[PDB]
Amino acid sequence: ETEDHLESLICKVGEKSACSLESNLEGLAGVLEADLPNYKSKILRLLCTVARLLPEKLTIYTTLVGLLNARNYNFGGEFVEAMIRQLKESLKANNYNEAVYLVRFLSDLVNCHVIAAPSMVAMFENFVSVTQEEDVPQVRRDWYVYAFLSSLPWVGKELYEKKDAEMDRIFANTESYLKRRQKTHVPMLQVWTADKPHPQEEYLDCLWAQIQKLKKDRWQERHILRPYLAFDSILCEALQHNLPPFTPPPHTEDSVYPMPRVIFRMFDYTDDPEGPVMPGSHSVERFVIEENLHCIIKSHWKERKTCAAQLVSYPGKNKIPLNYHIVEVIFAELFQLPAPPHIDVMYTTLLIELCKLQPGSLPQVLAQATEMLYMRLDTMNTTCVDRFINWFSHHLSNFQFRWSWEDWSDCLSQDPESPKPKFVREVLEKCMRLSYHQRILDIVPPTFSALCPANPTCIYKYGDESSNSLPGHSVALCLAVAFKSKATNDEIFSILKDVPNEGFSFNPLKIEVFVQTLLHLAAKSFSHSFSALAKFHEVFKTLAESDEGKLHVLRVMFEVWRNHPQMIAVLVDKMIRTQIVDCAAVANWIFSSELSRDFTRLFVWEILHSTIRKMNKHVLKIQKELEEAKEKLARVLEEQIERLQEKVESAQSEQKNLFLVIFQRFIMILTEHLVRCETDGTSVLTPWYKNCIERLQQIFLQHHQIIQQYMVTLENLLFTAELDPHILAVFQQFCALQA
């Protein structure tokens, strides 16, 4: 297995070693030249792969290719050909994020005397000329500019020496493009609206400023490792290659571009005065550090111990406060809008594994960050706060819920609906769900017991202390007796006949005594409650066939379990899956007046989004049954495709009506608020409004791909010019994500 040996050698160069990086590269270059006779095929494929999947070690592998080009010109040429095939093929397949790494690899190959500087400037002329294409999306133009600008920390000096006139032109066109760019998306993607202590900048504005500072410093930067500089002798005698002319694959309607981004920023050098000086926001050093650290996480996300190791052992030309960069990059990913690159839970565990490797330094940085996140809560986007709450609570559960709560005493004098006390309330609630009510009461100071969650107990309407003058009290007691004694569906129905009040089918008291009682007797656990819903499923489906029946099941179920939101969430989930209720019912229930007082609480939105997700998966499932049965025809069954096509259309329709309902109810209550505020002259921006407008924002962020299907209907019928610009802004922001 020389094939496997070669992969392992190529991967292992650049990692921690007793010898120098230069020595290892020279050595490996020798070993690979020797194997070119009968492993050229393999070595090309491997180096093309590491160009695409290991951008974090870019300059190690460009140097390697440069040394191989010196010893064998023809090998260099085939590699450069393969890279261009790979680049064109990546763009064709909408892998724009892989394509950047390929563009940077080619760029830095100029510094290795493998590619002629003229070729690279010609390619970048064609990239920036995409800014003059007419009737194409901003996000297309953006990407070609970003691929250019983000390559310059590596190759910017060499190009601006060899062709300074041609680069000033490119820069001119780039600058005038950036000046006329629409920034509508920015408030939807910022983690904080406040521009102090750090503004959350738009990604291209920031990169531009970084490249401007780099240029002002004669293209000199203090971070990128450049192994090729120590092979100046060998690389200068090597002959260069020319890239073909590049024609960007033209914009089709099947083209899909990266969403714009906003750069996360919480630290500067003042947050670590003892340690090495942190590169500033507007330095390319900061860009390159964070880009590599993000890329390391991308490479090793599945292996939490490996990932932590690779981050801690990140090399640079100069000393940097690495623990701060690692923590900042992690929260940048976790709080990214619309969504993180990886599953949220991974970040919790990655930070644990980092604390394990760096127990003397990292935990203090993490606690310092946690302090700063809390103090900046007043303008944090709600979507990000939910994540902050879920991380912090889960983190605390892995370290004995130890936290200096009195540091956050400033929340106690504030309005309970303000971000800080709300944050603390929600965290403690989340802690309780991982622990138990008493444990959480114990781990906080007595000043904080006003913010603890209440005891998660059942509320039975027809219990001991309740008077027997309530409607259907005598029927409830009969149901209690029947349920305890293994009664059947018919016997329950029979008992429910003795209850007061198509042609007329919905009785609110039948539902009320049935639900109150059944939930009470299965209140022992989730498994018991689920078993009860299964056993008396036929009674549920008859009582709640009506749409007002479904809504009333949820109304009663809430009145029972309002102290135990976790229970509500799992019951609503089971009721949707067993079809007691439907998505539409849950949507209306959430915006109902009975939930009015709990509307700004996490659990409401956990339920909504969970409900939406079930709907989306339902449609996907039915869409795959259609696709599968069609491929069977392509190779009786034609009468089964017509039934599935009917099911897809009605499923897709249920999905669409779900979103339409949610948007209508949002538009209604937002308008109600805005009209009331223009009448009274009071502040629009209350805590309730902050939550409500940002929860609407979240529907778009979390489900942009599905909602893109409904653009024509939403422009024409819901989000029209008639709407208050406060509400319409959100929809315009949503449109900017792929405009």
Place this chain on the structure above:
Amino acid sequence: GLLKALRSDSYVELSQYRDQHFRGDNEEQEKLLKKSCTLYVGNLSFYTTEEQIYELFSKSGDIKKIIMGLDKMKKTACGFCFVEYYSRADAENAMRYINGTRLDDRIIRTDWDAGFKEGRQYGRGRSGGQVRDEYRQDYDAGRGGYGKLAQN
């Protein structure tokens, strides 16, 4: 094209364990484990609720069923459970990021299971609890006390 080092996914590999009461070949058991969406969950507290396991294991995805590990005799929780997910991907993520973290301050340990059948919820040790709880010498407040030999 891919690199072996990056394809590495060691938290999702099969453990040493096999179910000895499994009606079938070993090759037939591995075939099910590689397709499973069900996880055995070890080293829980006896006092850890079903509702706590739901909250934690929900962080990797949507849970279909939790089957608590029960004492065969007493039918109380004896410190394991099963968690079944709707999708494989969500179970893989639990194995990657929930595996080896804390629940009621104990390092829980997850493994792929071949699938729930009746009787598998019950501890297979002499005394009713788990086999692991009989031979052990240590004192463990969260697992009854001393092991069942040294108790009585």
Place this chain on the structure above:
Amino acid sequence: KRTQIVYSDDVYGF
């Protein structure tokens, strides 16, 4: 510190 619950014999479309 807390009370264990006892589990019954009988406890185990869209």
